[PDB]
């Protein structure tokens, strides 16, 4: 009666050994969140609906009212909720128009309850057959902010409802056990304190580096288990291949009878692109293929009748079509004997042996948590397997999203189990019971290719045996009470206590030992090889569990002779974990159960965070580990990845000004001939590090850039000076700090580096004056992420030189044209690097070439130089047959970047030829650091405030011109760096006098402008403006919050009494936002009508524009010459406004309505445009309405990334959206009633403060509503309370907030002396309890920081 069913996946995880026993699906619930079903697929089938747990819509529709449950409903007596949490209830479809379904395939491993033959003739099942399964659709995008709020109510649905278990497909690289994502977690926990189950797949990443090149031995903390699955509670799941495949696959009747290669049948795979089974699949054919090769022994790893020779493949043997496969050695690539090779091509499907059978998945996650906790907790298949697609479709799969669900199905048998042998376990202690069973009762996997038992840290407690689970009464702990023991870090002698729990009442007798691993490492390429080496197996003996009872055994081992050999292989640390075997003394066979460990033999607290500066290694000739050598010597293009130090490029032109700017370099390095970035060195062989403040946009900053080898957190950039050894007085910090991930690179979409920007030095104290030229450090700190760890430096030898080298004179003779300019020295401490000699080519009658892009819209200038070669002496002959003598220049360079140039025009009358000459030099300022158009005349009816002032290029992409105005109105600036409305500055008359001319910005609440929180640095007068000019920032450089602040100017110099200004300057920046307004046609012609614009505020508008840019030289930007330099303009052509309040938009010669623009500018500068052709994609019965976030914060610093959801007045979701101004937050929507709702945002930066639903209408006289969702920022900080000695036992410690609660701390496993939690930024009080008179001693108080780390180094008195 048709009951076929494939058991190639039940057969190893014993799943009949608890169906037979009653424990079927029957009566519990998997709540299963991913994307999506199609829940009416025959798999969705639950017979006896008299057994279930939820009887019908009449019980369901229950439940929703009394847990407080607005949304979804049932649908079968299989899938008894549903929500598609993307926008608040939808379909659960995910179809076409593969036709793949992720979310059921999931499913399907769980519940797969089927009566109906797939492509081989068998029914597949899940391993809960008969559990009634609700489903909450979750998934993740990009644009979205963060998806956790949706889960995490998905999460409190399944609880209140009342699932058992969920299976939460959810993942996030690198995960901690502890300090996970906090409204997460308490959801989870709640789940775990009724009867749920969590069960998280772990990930794909699979180890540090896994798309690139296995971990260098010194990296040892190379892990990525990721987050939620690293929680305590949930149970993390890796992944082992299946050992049978079901494929579409190639046949062959000439090895029909081999039975060494499934008779014939062979495996083949189609690469990145052009799967050409469209070309003749399920038809014999001849040796007329593209057989590749063997590849290897074992690896199965990606005439002539079609003769293309395809080598856009091979590329490398000793994308483009010819013909793609993939077969391995055994397979064919041996059993080419005849070669005329009849091939059949499956005009079906087939049932195969894995290549990887019983191999551990390559992606599968691993490693410790990051902060060093022992995860996944438990493998099961996932590999490749079969189950439920869209509709009436089979599977396929590799992937630990398939072995999670597994877990899942057993989770929910057990807890059957459990129910019928255990009721009096409360719902408070079921689930980490069900887990436990799980991890204790599981096969120590076997690494097929070593034979060595494959890595706890790779498989948790092994493969999954659900029989063992339900079969044995048996389960054990370590001393946490948990199924694996994290000992942490780890002496010359490993000592812990294991415990054995029996809940049959027929004690029981074990035999045990002990299997102890550590890492292999090719010894030739100094990698970890991912593989482990067994070591000894230590045995301890027998001992005895009671029954429903425990016992307390203790294992114990001494490594001293390993540490040797070890520690030479792994100098930084390794680990030494394994299994805590047990079976029955007598019947070896009976109550096999285990537990793993793993511990560290070093500190893994204080592993390195970042790999070494790039400098320092090649001080050592090693190199960087995503490190690229390719290219000249020592070329460190800032492109590559490492760890070192990025500044900004600007060449230095004698023919006109500079317009652009080289972009990032690595510093010290410095353009070659060719174009290679280089490390040049200085006369002892190093590299210097320099950086020259002086204005001039050539290595102005020092940023720092980093490859990570751990997830850091308290990242930031101070400077000392040099004399400072201790580095004990900061002159200088960077005002933000930094927390970030792992370069683990599992592929392209992860960063090999990550550059810093944040951590910017431009040799400002922390007042704003300037630092003086010298020898400093700049120390880059951070932390790792597990409590207790020692906080590492990295410090970088830095010089400021700000002084150009010398050029004094130089000896000329004129019989052979010698150049001998002298001795190099160079002012400051940067030393000179290099001599030049070049003059100016002239081409197309100009000494420098105009380049413009045409596709980014961008125009560079450059200086015609060419070079006259040095020789080995030093001097220069000069060719005076190409140019004049005396239009040569000669060029000297600082390290830091400061550069001399000299012309020959300090020169004597005609002289032309006769003798050896002395010649004086002198630096002609060529490198100048460009200052702004003043043109200004003031008088005393000014305010003497002055303010910058430039348009807004809306085509061209260069710096658009600006200059100096007078600001008597509207003290708003809008400190955005575009040159209009920066800052203020004040300029004086010019015939009177201006003594100690100082200002001080003082804020909004400095009654008796007591505190400046800015001033003007020493030596700042009424003429020099830039240094009377605020860009709205605080002395330390980072901005000032949009606001009111006192800008107050002093001078003394009224040639006795002095006086004070004391204007009230406003900052804000804030993009105006342009509404749509109207387009009529008049005459032949269109009219259009801007809506009216209001004045009062800041963001009132005051300057108003329609025009259109002409085609000149088919660009609409253009390059005019002046003396002053080239400058870079729009082609803007007005359009004056009539009398209507319209502007006459004329089509004119071919110009479009994309090519008029309307623009306005309000009283702070701040500039808006669109184009008229999106201004009118309104309709004129139609309106819009844009949303957007309020934060509190500068408008460069704040989210841009939510999602909202519209109904319409019957609440339906708007459909069919259109979007307007390219804003995706700008709908365009008839005339009506509507309502917005905020679903997503990232609630880790921000919380909402306004109500979340919104309602608005859109009417005629009401076209345009802004709603906006009021949001207030949120900053953490680490604390950690490190103690003198370990604290007695029963000790308590906790931080006590000044509203007056406790947040509990716990004893750091790492660092026993360290407790330590992150927390919401504020002031705490490490409190202590303490049995006994023993009174903890001094400051227990702290006032955090976002994103600093905070220590508190107590003392246990007596
Ligand atoms: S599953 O949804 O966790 C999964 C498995 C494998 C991949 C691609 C890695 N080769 C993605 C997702
Ligand atoms: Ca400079
Ligand atoms: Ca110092
Ligand atoms: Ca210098
Ligand atoms: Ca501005």
Redesign the pocket.
Same mark, same amino acid.
């Given at each position: 009666s048709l009951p076929p069913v494939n058991t190639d996946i039940h057969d190893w995880v014993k799943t009949k050994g608890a169906w037979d026993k009653g424990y079927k699906g029957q009566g519990k619930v998997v709540a299963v969140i991913d994307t999506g079903i199609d829940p009416a697929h025959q798999s969705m089938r639950i017979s006896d609906v008299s057994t279930a747990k939820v009887k019908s819509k009449e019980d369901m529709l229950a439940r929703q009212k009394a847990a407080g449950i607005n949304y979804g409903s049932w649908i079968n007596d299989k899938v008894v909720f549903a929500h598609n949490y993307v926008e608040n209830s939808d379909n659960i479809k995910e179809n076409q128009f593969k036709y793949e379904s992720?979310g059921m395939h999931v499913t399907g491993i769980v519940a797969g309850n089927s009566k109906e033959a797939a492509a081989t003739g068998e029914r597949f099942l899940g391993i809960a057959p008969e559990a009634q399964v609700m489903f909450m659709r979750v998934f993740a995008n990009d644009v979205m902010g963060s998806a956790e709020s949706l889960f995490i109510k998905a999460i409190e649905d399944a609880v209140a409802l009342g699932a058992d278990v969920i299976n939460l497909?959810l =993942?996030t690289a690198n995960g901690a056990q502890l300090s996970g994502s906090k409204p997460l977690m308490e959801a989870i926990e709640k789940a775990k304190k009724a009867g749920v189950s969590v069960v998280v797949?772990a =990930?794909?990443e699979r180890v540090y580096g896994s798309d690139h090149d296995d971990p260098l031995a010194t990296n040892p903390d190379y892990g990525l288990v990721g987050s939620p699955s690293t929680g305590r509670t949930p149970t993390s799941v890796a992944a082992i291949n299946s050992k049978w495949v079901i494929q579409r696959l190639m046949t062959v009747e000439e090895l029909e009878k081999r039975a060494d290669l499934n008779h014939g049948k062979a495996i083949y795979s189609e690469s990145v692109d052009f799967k050409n089974i469209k070309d003749s699949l399920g038809y014999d054919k001849s040796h007329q293929f593209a057989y590749v090769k063997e590849s290897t022994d074992a690896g199965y790893n990606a005439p002539n009748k079609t003769y293309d020779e395809m080598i856009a493949l091979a590329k490398k043997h000793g994308i483009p079509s010819a013909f793609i496969s993939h077969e391995f050695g055994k397979a064919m690539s041996q059993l080419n004997g005849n070669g005329t090779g009849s091939l059949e091509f499956d005009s079906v499907v087939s049932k195969a042996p894995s290549q990887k059978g019983n191999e551990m998945n390559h992606?599968s996650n691993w490693g410790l948590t990051s902060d060093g906790y022992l995860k996944p907790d438990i493998t099961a298949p996932g590999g490749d397997i079969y189950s439920t697609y869209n509709d009436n479709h089979y599977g396929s799969?590799?992937?630990?999203?398939?072995a999670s669900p597994q877990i899942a199905g057993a989770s929910l048998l057990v807890k059957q189990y459990l129910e019928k042998t255990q009721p009096n376990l409360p719902k408070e202690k079921i689930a980490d019971i069900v887990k436990n069973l799980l991890m204790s009762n599981a096969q120590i996997h076997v690494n097929p290719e070593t034979k060595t038992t494959t890595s706890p840290r790779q498989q948790g407690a092994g493969l999954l045996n659900i029989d063992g689970a339900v079969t044995s009464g048996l389960y054990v702990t370590g001393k946490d009470n948990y199924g694996s023991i994290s000992l942490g870090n780890i002496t010359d002698t490993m000592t812990f206590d294991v415990t054995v729990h029996n809940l049959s009442n027929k004690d029981k007798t074990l035999r045990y030992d002990t299997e102890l691993l550590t890492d292999h490492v090719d010894p030739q390429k100094g990698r970890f090889t991912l593989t482990s080496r067994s070591l000894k197996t230590y045995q301890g003996g027998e001992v005895t569990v009671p029954a429903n009872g425990k016992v307390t055994v203790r294992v114990t081992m001494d490594v001293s002779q390993f540490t040797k050999e070890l520690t030479k292989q792994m100098p930084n640390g390794y680990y030494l974990e394994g299994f805590v075997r047990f079976r029955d003394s007598q019947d070896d066979q009976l109550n096999r159960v285990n537990i793993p460990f793993v511990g560290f033999k070093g500190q893994f607290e204080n592993l390195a965070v970042a790999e070494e500066s790039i400098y320092r290694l090649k001080s050592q000739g090693k190199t960087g580990f995503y490190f690229d050598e390719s290219g000249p010597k020592d070329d460190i293009y800032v492109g590559k990845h490492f760890t070192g130090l990025v500044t900004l490029g600007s060449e230095t032109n004698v023919s006109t000004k500079t317009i652009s700017d080289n972009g990032l370099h690595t510093l010290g390095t410095f353009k070659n001939a060719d174009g290679k970035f280089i490390l040049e060195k200085n006369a002892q062989g190093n590299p210097v590090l320099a950086i020259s403040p002086n204005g001039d946009n050539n290595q102005d900053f020092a940023a720092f850039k980093g490859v990570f080898l751990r997830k850091y957190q308290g990242l930031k950039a101070s400077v000392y000076h040099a004399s400072d050894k201790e580095h004990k007085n900061p002159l200088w910090v960077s005002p933000e700090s930094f927390k970030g991930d792992k370069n683990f690179n599992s592929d392209i979409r992860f960063a090999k580096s990550t550059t810093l920007l944040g951590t910017a030095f431009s040799g400002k104290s922390l007042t704003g004056a300037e630092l003086p030229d010298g020898y400093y450090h700049y120390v880059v700190s951070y932390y790792p992420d597990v409590v207790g760890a020692k906080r590492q430096e990295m410090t970088f030898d830095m010089i400021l030189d700000r002084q150009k080298p010398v050029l004094s004179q130089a000896t000329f003779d004129p019989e052979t044209n010698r150049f001998k300019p002298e001795p190099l020295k160079d002012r400051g401490l940067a030393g000179v690097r290099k001599d030049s000699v070049f003059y100016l080519e002239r081409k197309d009658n100009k000494p420098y070439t105009v380049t413009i892009n045409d596709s980014y819209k961008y125009v560079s200038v450059e200086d015609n130089k060419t070079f006259v070669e040095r020789q080995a002496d030093g001097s220069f002959i000069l060719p005076l047959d190409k140019a004049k003598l005396g239009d040569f220049y000669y060029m000297v360079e600082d390290f830091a970047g400061n550069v001399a140039i000299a012309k020959l025009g300090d020169h004597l009358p005609q002289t032309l030829g006769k003798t050896p000459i002395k010649l004086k030099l002198t630096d002609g300022n060529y490198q100048t650091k460009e200052t702004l158009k003043d043109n200004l005349e003031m008088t005393q009816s000014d305010t003497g405030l002055v303010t910058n002032q430039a348009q807004l290029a809306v085509v061209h992409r260069n710096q658009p011109q600006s200059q100096l105005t007078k600001m008597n109105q509207d003290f708003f600036i809008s400190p955005n760096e575009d040159g209009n409305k920066d800052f203020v500055a004040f300029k004086g008359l010019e015939n009177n006098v201006y003594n100690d001319l100082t200002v001080n910005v003082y804020a909004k609440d400095d009654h008796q402008k007591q505190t400046p929180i800015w001033s003007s640095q020493a030596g700042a007068g009424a003429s020099a403006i830039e240094s009377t000019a605020w860009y709205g920032i605080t002395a330390r450089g980072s901005k000032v919050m949009p606001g009111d602040y006192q800008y107050v100017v002093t001078y003394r110099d009224e040639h006795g009494k002095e006086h004070q200004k004391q204007y009230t300057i406003s900052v804000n920046d804030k993009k105006p936002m342009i509404t749509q307004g109207r387009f009529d046609t008049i005459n032949g012609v269109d009219h259009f009508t801007p809506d009216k614009t209001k004045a009062l505020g800041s963001s009132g508008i005051v300057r108003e524009e329609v025009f259109y840019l002409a085609k000149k030289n088919g660009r609409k930007f253009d390059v005019t010459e002046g003396k002053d330099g080239i400058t870079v303009s729009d082609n803007k052509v007005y359009i004056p406004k009539n009398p209507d309040g319209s502007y006459t938009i004329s089509k004119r010669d071919g110009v479009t309505l994309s090519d008029y623009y309307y623009l306005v500018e309000d009283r702070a500068g701040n500039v808006s445009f669109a184009t008229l052709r999106d201004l009118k994609a309104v309709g004129k019965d139609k309106a819009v309405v844009n949303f957007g976030l309020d934060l509190p914060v500068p408008e460069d610093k704040q989210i841009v990334n939510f999602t909202y959801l519209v109904r319409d007045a019957d609440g339906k979701p708007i459909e069919n959206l259109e979007y307007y101004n390219n804003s995706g937050n700008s709908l365009i929507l008839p005339y009506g009633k509507y309502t917005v709702e905020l679903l997503t945002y990232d609630t880790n930066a921000a919380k909402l403060e306004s109500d979340k639903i919104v309602s608005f209408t859109l009417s005629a006289d009401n076209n345009f509503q802004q709603v906006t969702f009021k949001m207030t920022m949120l900053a953490t900080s680490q604390i950690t309370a490190h103690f003198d000695h370990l604290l007695p036992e029963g000790s308590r410690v906790s931080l006590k907030t000044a509203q007056g609660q406790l947040i509990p701390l716990e004893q750091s496993l790492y660092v026993p002396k360290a407790y330590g939690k992150t927390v919401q930024e504020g002031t705490y009080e490490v409190v202590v309890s303490l049995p006994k008179g023993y009174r903890i001693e001094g400051n227990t108080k702290v006032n955090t920081l976002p994103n600093e780390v905070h220590e508190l180094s107590l003392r246990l008195v007596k």
């Amino acid at each position: 009666s048709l009951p076929p069913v494939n058991t190639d996946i039940h057969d190893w995880v014993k799943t009949k050994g608890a169906w037979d026993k009653g424990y079927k699906g029957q009566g519990k619930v998997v709540a299963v969140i991913d994307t999506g079903i199609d829940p009416a697929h025959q798999s969705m089938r639950i017979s006896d609906v008299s057994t279930a747990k939820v009887k019908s819509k009449e019980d369901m529709l229950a439940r929703q009212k009394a847990a407080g449950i607005n949304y979804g409903s049932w649908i079968n007596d299989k899938v008894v909720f549903a929500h598609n949490y993307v926008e608040n209830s939808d379909n659960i479809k995910e179809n076409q128009f593969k036709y793949e379904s992720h979310g059921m395939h999931v499913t399907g491993i769980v519940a797969g309850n089927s009566k109906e033959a797939a492509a081989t003739g068998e029914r597949f099942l899940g391993i809960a057959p008969e559990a009634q399964v609700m489903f909450m659709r979750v998934f993740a995008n990009d644009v979205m902010g963060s998806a956790e709020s949706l889960f995490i109510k998905a999460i409190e649905d399944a609880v209140a409802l009342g699932a058992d278990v969920i299976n939460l497909s959810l =993942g996030t690289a690198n995960g901690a056990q502890l300090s996970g994502s906090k409204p997460l977690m308490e959801a989870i926990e709640k789940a775990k304190k009724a009867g749920v189950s969590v069960v998280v797949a772990a =990930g794909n990443e699979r180890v540090y580096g896994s798309d690139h090149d296995d971990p260098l031995a010194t990296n040892p903390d190379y892990g990525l288990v990721g987050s939620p699955s690293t929680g305590r509670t949930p149970t993390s799941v890796a992944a082992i291949n299946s050992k049978w495949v079901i494929q579409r696959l190639m046949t062959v009747e000439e090895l029909e009878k081999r039975a060494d290669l499934n008779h014939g049948k062979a495996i083949y795979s189609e690469s990145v692109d052009f799967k050409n089974i469209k070309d003749s699949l399920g038809y014999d054919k001849s040796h007329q293929f593209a057989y590749v090769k063997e590849s290897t022994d074992a690896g199965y790893n990606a005439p002539n009748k079609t003769y293309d020779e395809m080598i856009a493949l091979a590329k490398k043997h000793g994308i483009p079509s010819a013909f793609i496969s993939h077969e391995f050695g055994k397979a064919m690539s041996q059993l080419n004997g005849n070669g005329t090779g009849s091939l059949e091509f499956d005009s079906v499907v087939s049932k195969a042996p894995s290549q990887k059978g019983n191999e551990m998945n390559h992606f599968s996650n691993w490693g410790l948590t990051s902060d060093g906790y022992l995860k996944p907790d438990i493998t099961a298949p996932g590999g490749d397997i079969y189950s439920t697609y869209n509709d009436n479709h089979y599977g396929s799969q590799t992937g630990t999203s398939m072995a999670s669900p597994q877990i899942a199905g057993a989770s929910l048998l057990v807890k059957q189990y459990l129910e019928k042998t255990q009721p009096n376990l409360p719902k408070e202690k079921i689930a980490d019971i069900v887990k436990n069973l799980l991890m204790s009762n599981a096969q120590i996997h076997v690494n097929p290719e070593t034979k060595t038992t494959t890595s706890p840290r790779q498989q948790g407690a092994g493969l999954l045996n659900i029989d063992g689970a339900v079969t044995s009464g048996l389960y054990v702990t370590g001393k946490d009470n948990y199924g694996s023991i994290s000992l942490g870090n780890i002496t010359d002698t490993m000592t812990f206590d294991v415990t054995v729990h029996n809940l049959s009442n027929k004690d029981k007798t074990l035999r045990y030992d002990t299997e102890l691993l550590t890492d292999h490492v090719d010894p030739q390429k100094g990698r970890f090889t991912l593989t482990s080496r067994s070591l000894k197996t230590y045995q301890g003996g027998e001992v005895t569990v009671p029954a429903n009872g425990k016992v307390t055994v203790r294992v114990t081992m001494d490594v001293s002779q390993f540490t040797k050999e070890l520690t030479k292989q792994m100098p930084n640390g390794y680990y030494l974990e394994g299994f805590v075997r047990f079976r029955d003394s007598q019947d070896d066979q009976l109550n096999r159960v285990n537990i793993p460990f793993v511990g560290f033999k070093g500190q893994f607290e204080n592993l390195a965070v970042a790999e070494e500066s790039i400098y320092r290694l090649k001080s050592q000739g090693k190199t960087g580990f995503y490190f690229d050598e390719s290219g000249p010597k020592d070329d460190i293009y800032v492109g590559k990845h490492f760890t070192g130090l990025v500044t900004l490029g600007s060449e230095t032109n004698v023919s006109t000004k500079t317009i652009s700017d080289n972009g990032l370099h690595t510093l010290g390095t410095f353009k070659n001939a060719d174009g290679k970035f280089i490390l040049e060195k200085n006369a002892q062989g190093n590299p210097v590090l320099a950086i020259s403040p002086n204005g001039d946009n050539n290595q102005d900053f020092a940023a720092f850039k980093g490859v990570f080898l751990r997830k850091y957190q308290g990242l930031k950039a101070s400077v000392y000076h040099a004399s400072d050894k201790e580095h004990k007085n900061p002159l200088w910090v960077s005002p933000e700090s930094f927390k970030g991930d792992k370069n683990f690179n599992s592929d392209i979409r992860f960063a090999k580096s990550t550059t810093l920007l944040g951590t910017a030095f431009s040799g400002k104290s922390l007042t704003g004056a300037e630092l003086p030229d010298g020898y400093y450090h700049y120390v880059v700190s951070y932390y790792p992420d597990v409590v207790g760890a020692k906080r590492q430096e990295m410090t970088f030898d830095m010089i400021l030189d700000r002084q150009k080298p010398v050029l004094s004179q130089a000896t000329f003779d004129p019989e052979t044209n010698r150049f001998k300019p002298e001795p190099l020295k160079d002012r400051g401490l940067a030393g000179v690097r290099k001599d030049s000699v070049f003059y100016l080519e002239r081409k197309d009658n100009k000494p420098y070439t105009v380049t413009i892009n045409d596709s980014y819209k961008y125009v560079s200038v450059e200086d015609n130089k060419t070079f006259v070669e040095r020789q080995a002496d030093g001097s220069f002959i000069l060719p005076l047959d190409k140019a004049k003598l005396g239009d040569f220049y000669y060029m000297v360079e600082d390290f830091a970047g400061n550069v001399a140039i000299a012309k020959l025009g300090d020169h004597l009358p005609q002289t032309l030829g006769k003798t050896p000459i002395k010649l004086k030099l002198t630096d002609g300022n060529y490198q100048t650091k460009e200052t702004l158009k003043d043109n200004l005349e003031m008088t005393q009816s000014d305010t003497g405030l002055v303010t910058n002032q430039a348009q807004l290029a809306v085509v061209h992409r260069n710096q658009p011109q600006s200059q100096l105005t007078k600001m008597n109105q509207d003290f708003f600036i809008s400190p955005n760096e575009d040159g209009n409305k920066d800052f203020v500055a004040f300029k004086g008359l010019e015939n009177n006098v201006y003594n100690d001319l100082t200002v001080n910005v003082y804020a909004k609440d400095d009654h008796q402008k007591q505190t400046p929180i800015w001033s003007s640095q020493a030596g700042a007068g009424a003429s020099a403006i830039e240094s009377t000019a605020w860009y709205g920032i605080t002395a330390r450089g980072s901005k000032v919050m949009p606001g009111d602040y006192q800008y107050v100017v002093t001078y003394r110099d009224e040639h006795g009494k002095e006086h004070q200004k004391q204007y009230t300057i406003s900052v804000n920046d804030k993009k105006p936002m342009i509404t749509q307004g109207r387009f009529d046609t008049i005459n032949g012609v269109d009219h259009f009508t801007p809506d009216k614009t209001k004045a009062l505020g800041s963001s009132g508008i005051v300057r108003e524009e329609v025009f259109y840019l002409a085609k000149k030289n088919g660009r609409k930007f253009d390059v005019t010459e002046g003396k002053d330099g080239i400058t870079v303009s729009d082609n803007k052509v007005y359009i004056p406004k009539n009398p209507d309040g319209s502007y006459t938009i004329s089509k004119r010669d071919g110009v479009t309505l994309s090519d008029y623009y309307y623009l306005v500018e309000d009283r702070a500068g701040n500039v808006s445009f669109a184009t008229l052709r999106d201004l009118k994609a309104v309709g004129k019965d139609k309106a819009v309405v844009n949303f957007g976030l309020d934060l509190p914060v500068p408008e460069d610093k704040q989210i841009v990334n939510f999602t909202y959801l519209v109904r319409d007045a019957d609440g339906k979701p708007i459909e069919n959206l259109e979007y307007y101004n390219n804003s995706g937050n700008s709908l365009i929507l008839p005339y009506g009633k509507y309502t917005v709702e905020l679903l997503t945002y990232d609630t880790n930066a921000a919380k909402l403060e306004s109500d979340k639903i919104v309602s608005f209408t859109l009417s005629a006289d009401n076209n345009f509503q802004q709603v906006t969702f009021k949001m207030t920022m949120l900053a953490t900080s680490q604390i950690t309370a490190h103690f003198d000695h370990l604290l007695p036992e029963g000790s308590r410690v906790s931080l006590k907030t000044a509203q007056g609660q406790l947040i509990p701390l716990e004893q750091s496993l790492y660092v026993p002396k360290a407790y330590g939690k992150t927390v919401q930024e504020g002031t705490y009080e490490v409190v202590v309890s303490l049995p006994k008179g023993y009174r903890i001693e001094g400051n227990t108080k702290v006032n955090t920081l976002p994103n600093e780390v905070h220590e508190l180094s107590l003392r246990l008195v007596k």
